[PDB]
């Protein structure tokens, strides 16, 4: 690989602390199937290969960078990469915890 920065990731946010559920449902068409969490205000939305919710909650919010609930990847929708960064582990890692623990 991914990018090993992008200027996009000023606008990860906190997460939550109610932490992360890999297997929440799309908040759109509620399919349980490649979810995507918004890293910006943690909505769950599917992946382009289902409905496409979360590319339209891109351009609906601009937020840039979602992680994905199937493989823990972090795409930016503007600059059209992966990225990993530093500032990424806090989140992969609960999400890892979720998923796999
Ligand atoms: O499915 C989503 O809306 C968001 C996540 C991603 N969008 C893309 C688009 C391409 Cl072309 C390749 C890899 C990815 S990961
Ligand atoms: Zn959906
Ligand atoms: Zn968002
Ligand atoms: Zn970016």
Same mark, same amino acid.
């Given at each position: 690989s991914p990018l090993p920065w992008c200027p996009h990731l000023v606008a990860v946010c906190p997460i939550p602390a109610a932490g992360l559920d890999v297997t929440q449902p799309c +908040?759109?068409? +509620?399919?349980?199937?490649?979810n995507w969490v918004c890293l910006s205000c943690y909505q769950v939305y599917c992946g382009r290969y289902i409905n496409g919710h979360m590319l339209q909650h891109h351009g609906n919010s601009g937020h840039p960078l979602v992680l994905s609930y199937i493989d823990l990847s972090a795409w930016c929708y503007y600059c059209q990469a992966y990225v990993h960064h530093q500032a990424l582990l806090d989140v992969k890692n609960i999400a890892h915890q979720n998923k796999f623990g």
């Open positions: +908040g759109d068409c +509620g399919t349980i199937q490649e």
